[PDB]
Amino acid sequence: DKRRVAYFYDADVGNYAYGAGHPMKPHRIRMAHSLIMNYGLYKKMEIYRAKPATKQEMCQFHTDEYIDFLSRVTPDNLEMFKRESVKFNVGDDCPVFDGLYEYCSISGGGSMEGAARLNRGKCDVAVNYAGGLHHAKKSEASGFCYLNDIVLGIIELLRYHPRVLYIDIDVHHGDGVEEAFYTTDRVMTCSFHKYGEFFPGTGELRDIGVGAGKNYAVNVPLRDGIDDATYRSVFEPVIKKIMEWYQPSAVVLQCGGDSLSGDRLGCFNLSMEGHANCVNYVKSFGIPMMVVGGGGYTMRNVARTWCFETGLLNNVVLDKDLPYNEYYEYYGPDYKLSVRPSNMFNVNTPEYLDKVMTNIFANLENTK
Amino acid sequence: EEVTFFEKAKRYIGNKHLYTEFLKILNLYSQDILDLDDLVEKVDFYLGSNKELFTWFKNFVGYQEAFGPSYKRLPKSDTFMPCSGRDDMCWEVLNDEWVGHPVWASEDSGFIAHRKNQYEETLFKIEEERHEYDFYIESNLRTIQCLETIVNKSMTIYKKVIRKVYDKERGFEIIDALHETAPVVLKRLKQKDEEWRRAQREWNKVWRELEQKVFFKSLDHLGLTFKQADKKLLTTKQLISEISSIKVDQTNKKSQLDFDFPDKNIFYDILCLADTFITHTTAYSNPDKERLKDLLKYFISLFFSISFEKIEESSIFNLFANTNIYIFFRHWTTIYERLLEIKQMNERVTKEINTRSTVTFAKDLDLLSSQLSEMGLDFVGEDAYKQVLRLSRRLINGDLEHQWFEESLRQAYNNKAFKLYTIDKVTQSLVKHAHTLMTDAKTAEIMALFVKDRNASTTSAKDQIIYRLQVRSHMSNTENMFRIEFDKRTLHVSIQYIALDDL
Amino acid sequence: KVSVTGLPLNKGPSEKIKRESLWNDLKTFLTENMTEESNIRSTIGWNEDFCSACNQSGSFLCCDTCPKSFHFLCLDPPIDPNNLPKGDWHCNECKFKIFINNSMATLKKIESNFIKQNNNVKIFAKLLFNIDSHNPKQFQLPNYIKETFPAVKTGSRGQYSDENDKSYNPDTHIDSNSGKFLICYKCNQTRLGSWSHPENSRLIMTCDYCQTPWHLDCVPRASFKNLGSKWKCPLHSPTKVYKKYKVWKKQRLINKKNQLYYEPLQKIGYQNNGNIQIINQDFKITQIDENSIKYDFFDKIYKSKMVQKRK
Amino acid sequence: FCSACNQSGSFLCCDTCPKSFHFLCLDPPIDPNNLPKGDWHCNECKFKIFINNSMATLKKIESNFIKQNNNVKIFAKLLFNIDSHNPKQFQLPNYIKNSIKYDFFDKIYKSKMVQKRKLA
Amino acid sequence: SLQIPIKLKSVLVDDWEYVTKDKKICRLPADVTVEMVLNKYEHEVSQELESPGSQSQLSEYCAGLKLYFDKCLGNMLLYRLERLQYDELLKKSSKDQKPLVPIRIYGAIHLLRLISVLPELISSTTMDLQSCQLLIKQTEDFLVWLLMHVDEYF
Amino acid sequence: ISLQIPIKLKSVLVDDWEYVTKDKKICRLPADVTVEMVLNKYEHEVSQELESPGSQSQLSEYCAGLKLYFDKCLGNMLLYRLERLQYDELLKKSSKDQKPLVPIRIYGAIHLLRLISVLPELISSTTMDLQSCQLLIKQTEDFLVWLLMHVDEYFNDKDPNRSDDALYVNTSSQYEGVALGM
Ligand SMILES: [Zn+2]
Ligand SMILES: [Zn+2]
Ligand SMILES: [Zn+2]
Ligand SMILES: [Zn+2]
Ligand SMILES: [Zn+2]
Ligand SMILES: [Zn+2]
Ligand SMILES: [Zn+2]
């Protein structure tokens, strides 16, 4: 394909942190950058620093009260906001730290600027790993997410494109993005997630949409221990059929590392290559794409996967020997660019997946 | 035919409590409370496995928005909330009515978290400490760089840095003074950075040695629990249950179990392991060891017709057996299948181990483990299959610990050889089952009849009946029999479970 | 101070941890000189631990004359927490007992209110007077309505509860009551698998209402049910129907004392709801018998056949 | 007074209830000379002792009779009550002045003949 | 209640006058008895019903009407001046030792009075509101059919 | 003491309990038919039948007393905990326009039904005489019979996800969080 790649990075994004024991850390974004520059990928990409988002730009999706609470809340004065903390779920589930608003603005500005560069034709691939918060919904924090920057980026994309595809390969259901566009045919959301007694609670096979957006929401509920050979056998046919029938003008891809083997919260068994195969397959279609990096709670694995995927977007295959970045001590015994799957058992039988794909293909008939 | 549909459905359903619900559904349809679609879907759930009755029913009755379970509709009053930056297109495409909220989708109960082993927890703790040290050091370094840029010639970072350095609660006054003392904070921060970096070096050493031992254990899931599950699931009852289940499934719709042996060197490897255990074990007398070796060699040479001379220096056939011989054969097949699985990846794993490159920037220089290299448990050269066999022989002898054997297998096969952790116990059980095949009169007579039949090589159809009748005469009248069929053209084994069908 | 390592963050080795955890293509510095500002956005031009009203946890506004604490909303009228009363606060009964409760002459005041309301209402005057001495209290059904339905129970918080509220493991395929194998209704197989090949087995569920067993792959489903409502297999009556709209709901279960039964004499065409039984006067349960159901079904099929063939 | 035609003549007196009936105004009629030579009860006051003393309890005989006469079920509650009333003269209404499958198959068979001959 | 046509009311009053004033009891079993009328009704009406449930209802109604005319004839469906005649019939049935079938003795005059007081009998029962309507509808249909064939019966 | 409620009304009350405490639904306020309208229709339909003034003035007295008791006790004992926030909002909407809140003109027919369900306990916790209790119970039972007659036009069953004019509405997360968390 030989696309031109815009890459967004803010050097201050890594200086914000959640609580002491909180699994979600922006530091991995600082790590994936350190590999990317040390592999020499800056010679193939255009590196930008997006202007942070403003309150009015955030309020295109969220409410004024929620955004106003986010711009005022502080760990010091949390006791003065007792009704808003339960309104917006910014208490114990999603904590409040020192750099919440600037981090949210950085993420949203990155996503919106990437979408804007895709609109103007400046590039054909926009990369923003700070983005990808796919859980916040317009009035409340959810799943460690406080601002849905994917929705803002898709809104910026809809000003030039008739149809936009959104693909989610995180273990969690993309509840915020699916809910935001649940009644429209302009945006088609497709999620591959673990369904059961898992956090998003939503993402059933019968959640195809409401109203004009009926049949424009696809959910693939999977089981524990899925591996690369099965994940790709599910992912390629569904995405191919969506591409032929929905025919999107642009695609957003949330590359969350929650599906990698060895994650704290995830329960999948995907290696680095099985996770990057999805990005390669989506890139092989030729339409404009925006890659965002969402979940992931093992920094050494998600950073390596993001660096490998960024290399793949630049039409190169990176060497398996690390280039001695700053955080060299994080990368285990062999110090290789690889993520090793475990020997855990796969409970995704071919019959269950066959039934799921049959249902999805039956629903997809009414999108062309 | 319309008159007999109800009794047909009654017979097919096979239960009264379900036929009652079927009649209730039919009644609901008969009172104009159910449209035809729900009736057809319910009768699909009832008689859909049958293909003729369902089609007949559909052609008789003349069959010729879908809300999701995880979305509610809010009242329009609670919809208009001021979004200042929203536009006409934004109002057009964004959804404000339907809401999902996982808590409702959780049925107000909660979510189940994924179980994690202790090695993963240790890895998480190491990562947490690394992240804390790096976060503090980098934040201090960025504040230092900004301060140097100020002195020599993006809001909360410096404030939180100087609030962390000054914990006396006086730090706010220092921030105020900074807004109106730059060298003072400069020299304080540089010293903090230096001491934190030294502590980070020492902790990095400690963390490296700690992680470098539990990393491979963290990725082993089925292996950790393995050597308790193998003991519980490799019993006679489990195998009988498996074959009985296969037979029951077949009868609800002569070759219950199928085995294919594509290699014969594995037989010699299993014989070598068995002989090693027999020589080592202090559980049999001196003549009994020779008797066990002779039994094993004779059985393997007679059943599979491999050889009789090279084996000790290294036309379908049928066997009617009781539980003992079946269990012995199942143990042999278990060992063979495990060794075959570890052997068919010989070339790939051997190439990986030999062509395993190392990083030159810091891996070769500083951060390496010769721990497995100090005991020769690194598989350099020493072809992986033969090295695994040698280590298994060492473990059987007793001069190798289980921990180091498992660790070498984990690091050499990427946790794909976890099923060999019990090779010693499986070999011991195979030897014990070979022994009980000697010290039982009935089993000895059955084995003698099998030897006579196998060596006859020219028998009529009566070989199928009179041989089975004689074996049953040597057998009891209540417990099971198994028919093991061997084909030499492709070396194929078929096991049939004749519980009492011979009576 | 103390960090996650348990050390002041400046020490390092921690000798005990040492003994426990031991055996015995350019850099990033050029990222500050190659980031072009991107500002081409199209939008860039812009005493008790519970509540005396509901008996539940949470933040409370306490009283001083008694050990009773109320929620801010569990109060008449509700009080906004930001606009604190900022003064001596009591509940209704404390105010009444401090200010009005003269027990020797209270009856005279009640009679005065009685005669004051005698012009309009005297059957409720005592009830109206009895309302100022009571604190707010959450509504609950008065314990003789719940007992009418022997399937409804009260949860810990007082909410409605009904009878729908509750590696390789081969023993789940065994009944354990008779030693037989659990045979799936859809496929007529148990699919036990084997220890050699644990991927040949299928998970089985054994529905909680009629005890019939199903495979997770035969009924489309991903995981087991362990926390939410009880699982019900697809072999049951809907008990709630939307007919094109009109809503039909099956009657609740009544205690057998008031559960009236009746057998009609018509037995061929008899309009009943889905409240039947195969063998105050608004909850009759018709006893219908199987032959009548057969005749009704055949009648409906034949009548619809004529209705369509007339056209 | 004969409580069947409400006229006068030679009656048959009762014992438990103060009622008098004619010898011919009975079902079945009795020869006037042929006395019962014992205890005689009319249609009433004989079902009363039948249901209050000999059988077990009230409202159970009716169910048994209805179940027994399930072949004619719409008239069961009338057939049960017909054997409880004394005979009366016919006064004007005052406003004039495997046995189941055989039936199932026969019903379907006749119904389908009607269907076919009506269609064409 | 029941909707009895005016002509059938006139026939009933004519019979009342012909029995209670000028005593002219009709002859012993006539050419058309209740059984013949009921079988011909069930035979000629069943050929115009397309529903098996309606066929079962019609058959059950006819059988119940026969079995109810058996036990009600001598009870309350005869005038006093006729009872003696009934008695003699009974005596004949006693002498010959042949069972009595009153469906095949009385006919087309005594079935009409049988469905003339049915609302009274139904009201003195505990039947539900839904089966009584079916009985009334069946009796009305039979009354209309009998009024259609009046010149050849009575 | 003892109140004879028809079984269908008990089913209605249990359905209300299930909707509020399990489905997290509330009432669509202001109601289409309020308590005042129901009581006015009952009084007009019943008083127009009988003619004795002694039995006619008692009906008006009963209706007026019922209205007063509802107005005085709805904010105290007739609301579940989830509904209270909604109540508070109404009060604010009442306080911003200087209009006092009159609950018999907002709530209707389902809060009256649950008003006359704890009347035995309210009567028991008083010093009332015997024949007054008998009269109150008789009037309440007559009203309950009348309401059971007109049950289909006051308690319909339509899903909030399908009809905008149902009796119940779904609550949002921002509402439920404040209601059951603060
Ligand atoms: Zn996630
Ligand atoms: Zn409370
Ligand atoms: Zn108090
Ligand atoms: Zn199955
Ligand atoms: Zn079930
Ligand atoms: Zn008489
Ligand atoms: Zn008597």
Numbering used by the authors:
A (entry chain B): 17 to 384
B (entry chain A): 664 to 727, 749 to 837, 859 to 885, 890 to 962, 972 to 1032, 1134 to 1322
C (entry chain D): 107 to 130, 166 to 187, 259 to 378, 400 to 477, 489 to 523, 534 to 565
D (entry chain F): 262 to 358, 545 to 567
E (entry chain E): 221 to 374
F (entry chain C): 220 to 401
What does the paper say about this structure?
The Rpd3 small (Rpd3S) complex recognizes histone H3 trimethylation on lysine 36 (H3K36me3) and deacetylates histones H3 and H4 at multiple sites across transcribed regions. The Rpd3S histone deacetylase (HDAC) complex recognizes H3K36me3 at coding regions and suppresses transcription from cryptic promoters via its deacetylase activity in yeast. Here we solved the cryo-electron microscopy structures of Saccharomyces cerevisiae Rpd3S in its free and H3K36me3 nucleosome-bound states. We demonstrated a unique architecture of Rpd3S, in which two copies of Eaf3–Rco1 heterodimers are asymmetrically assembled with Rpd3 and Sin3 to form a catalytic core complex.
For structural analysis, we co-expressed full-length S. cerevisiae Rpd3, Sin3, Rco1, Eaf3 and Ume1 in a baculovirus–insect cell system and successfully reconstituted the Rpd3S holo-enzyme. Next, we performed single-particle cryo-EM analysis and acquired an overall structural map of Rpd3S at 3.2 Å resolution. Using a focused refinement strategy, we obtained 2.7 Å and 3.2 Å maps of two local regions, the head–bridge–right arm and the left arm of the Rpd3S complex, which enabled de novo model building of approximately 1,800 residues of Rpd3S components with high accuracy. In the structural model, we identified one copy of Rpd3 and Sin3, and two copies of Eaf3 and Rco1. The modelled structure contains residues 664–1322 of Sin3, 17–384 of Rpd3, 220–401 of Eaf3-A, 221–374 of Eaf3-B, 107–565 of Rco1-A and 262–358 of Rco1-B, which constitute a catalytic core complex with Rpd3 positioned at the centre. Although Ume1 exists as a stoichiometric component of Rpd3S, its map is missing. Cross-linking mass spectrometry (XL-MS) further confirmed the existence of Ume1, which mainly interacts with the C-terminal tail of Sin3. Both the Sin3 C-terminal tail and Ume1 are invisible in the map, suggesting their flexible disposition. The two highly integrated MRG–PHD1–MID modules constitute the right and left arms of the Rpd3S complex, which use distinct surfaces for asymmetric Rpd3S assembly. Rpd3 is wrapped around by discrete regions of Sin3, Rco1-A and Eaf3-A, including HID-N, loopS, four-helix-finger (FHF) and HID-C of Sin3 HID domain, PHD1 and PHD2 fingers of Rco1-A, and a C-terminal helix tail (αE) of Eaf3-A from the front surface, as well as an extended α–β-coil (αβC) motif of Rco1-A from the back surface. In the Rpd3S complex, we observed that a long α-helix of Sin3 (α1) within the FHF motif covers the basic surface of Rpd3 and inserts two Glu fingers (Glu811 and Glu812) into the inositol phosphate-binding pocket.
